[PDB]
Write a protein that binds this ligand. Sequence first.
Ligand SMILES: c1ccc(-c2ccccn2)nc1
Ligand SMILES: c1ccc(-c2ccccn2)nc1
Ligand SMILES: [Zn+2]
Ligand SMILES: [Zn+2]
Ligand SMILES: [Zn+2]
Ligand SMILES: [Zn+2]
Lengths: 374, 374
Amino acid sequence: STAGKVIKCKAAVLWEEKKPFSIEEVEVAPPKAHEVRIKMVATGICRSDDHVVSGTLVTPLPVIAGHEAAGIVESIGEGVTTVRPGDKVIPLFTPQCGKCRVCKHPEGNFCLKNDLSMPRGTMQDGTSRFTCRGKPIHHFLGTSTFSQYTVVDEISVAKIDAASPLEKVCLIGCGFSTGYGSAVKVAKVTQGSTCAVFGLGGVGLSVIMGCKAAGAARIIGVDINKDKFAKAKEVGATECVNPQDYKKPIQEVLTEMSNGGVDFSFEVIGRLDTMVTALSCCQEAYGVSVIVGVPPDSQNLSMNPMLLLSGRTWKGAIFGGFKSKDSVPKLVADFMAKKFALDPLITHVLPFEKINEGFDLLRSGESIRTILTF
Amino acid sequence: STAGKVIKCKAAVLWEEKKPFSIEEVEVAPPKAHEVRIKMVATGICRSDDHVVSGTLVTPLPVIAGHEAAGIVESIGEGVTTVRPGDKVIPLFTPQCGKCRVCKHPEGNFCLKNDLSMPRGTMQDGTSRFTCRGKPIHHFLGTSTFSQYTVVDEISVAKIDAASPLEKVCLIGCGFSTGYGSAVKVAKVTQGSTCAVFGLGGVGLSVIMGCKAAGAARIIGVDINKDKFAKAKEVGATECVNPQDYKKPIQEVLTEMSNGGVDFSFEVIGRLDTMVTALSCCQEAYGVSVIVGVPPDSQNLSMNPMLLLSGRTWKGAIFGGFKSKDSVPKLVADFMAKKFALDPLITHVLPFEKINEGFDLLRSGESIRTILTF
Ligand SMILES: c1ccc(-c2ccccn2)nc1
Ligand SMILES: c1ccc(-c2ccccn2)nc1
Ligand SMILES: [Zn+2]
Ligand SMILES: [Zn+2]
Ligand SMILES: [Zn+2]
Ligand SMILES: [Zn+2]
């Protein structure tokens, strides 16, 4: 009934850097071949969406940002085979074309069809489905979820359980999957292991959850904010450490605590000093450190390569290591089968029109995750 | 007949830093409990032995250095079960006590009984078996192979094929195993893969050999010295690249050459810039870079953590990843079963008394490996 026609709707457009989002009436073109138009039901606010505002995640402006979300398919273009009008879906900010050597690779997930490396802010065909009073508006990571309606390429969407609570499983579009995958997939945490998690916001809590699912015996939470500790223990942390309580460097504290270094450490805050710290506190011979967050305006870090020469392994990933379209549905299936709870991560829920408020909660540190509802 | 008594023999003592070795008459005490006295048959000259001379590998002086070697057991102390008078043996500069959590760990090989981390320059019991005119002389890495005779702890020795040519299989004590393991064990090079090897001295040639054994489809040799290229191709390299031939940075050249990055890269030269280069030239999503050499007087390197956030894996090891006592005999068995040739690495052979000459060949770059014969 709206199929094949322009939809007039509201979206949160960022017209310029360092400005609040403007709720604007926009037009959303019908989906072309192999494109999918989605009515949004919920979208989380992620740190990476704010990097667009700060200018640190360089991408074309004006933009409709947002990339952690869920909704319902409104319609499909020619040749779409993987979703149908009515399906519950999660947009995939990391695509899975299934053809490139990354998608072919049994370990790789950073599909070369991504728009993160060298952002164009378009659909795969190099155009935009968005206008604001006839002006073109750029897409973001092929998702653009801060809109009542969006069009994504088929390679950027996954069909999920028709019975999922979208207001919750939207977290699987970024924050949860990223954390949880870091443990379960990238690091491959083993049973009886000792883990250390640097940063206890939403993505850190999700690492803790993955470490617990993997059967870690000790999960050491590390953050300078004490108030973060209760929820960390509530989701699986055995102990919590505030570095400001100590007179010695924190990697020494953690090495002592773990009788000569942890099995797996995770940097989830995105700071250069804590990255090196995290690597050092893991056991010199067989320790693994995983880099989860970054600052997209990153300087270089400075590290001593002897930390690696003893036998350490240092690594990062995007989207928790997960091949996106393959994994998103099983993660929802797991939630549905109650293998893990998402409610501990949701601290604030706001209507979409109060997006700017939600970003204030994010910028201030007062929320773990704000979910916006359409 | 010498069992249980002091042996008077010659050794190459370094009395002070930055000095030539002095061939001195020394006394070698009989082995105590769980110690093994070995008559040396051959010893290679390694870059790490020279780091002792430069003062960059800090270890107590005066010292008898050397750690890549083979010989014949002269006698055994009380309770030695793993070798017997007459056995052909390789001293293990990385021990395998078999008890510590590293030796227990299915991936780790840097046994915590090592004397590399915080060198004491003793036997495990904290004493020395060496005197020079009654002055005590320090051990080195529990091996001290620049001596006609040495005493090692049982955890620092492995019994090998009674039919091995010791003049060749001595390379398995460091240089070969380190290179070969880096490919086969640490990186786990896969079939059809594209590999890049930065540095084509002895340890680099050994990486090439491991990559070929693993079934790599492309092995790209990288060195600034053209003269090194023939022997690289002779042992398995498909192509060779001199960065001085190019007008653009070498990681760009290698990324282009490999259609968007190599599967596995290896830094074998020990330079901070080439370490970062090596990591960058591997494929962003599933690339692995392995650090093989170091400079023990190392500054920090400077790198951008975004290189890891895409999906790269960065790692180092000691002794090629190999659990030493477990692996040394099978590596000799493999040589004996002709699964790989060691003669391509041996460019110079000298009597032990011309040790200083051999180090000159090493310092100058004129040899790939000098073997000293007793
Ligand atoms: C934690 C860490 C990273 C990211 C991320 C990176 C790129 C694009 C979008 N989100 N999100 C949460
Ligand atoms: C290549 C790279 C490293 C080493 C090494 C390191 C520590 C002690 C001894 N040898 N040898 C050859
Ligand atoms: Zn792909
Ligand atoms: Zn995100
Ligand atoms: Zn051990
Ligand atoms: Zn060596």
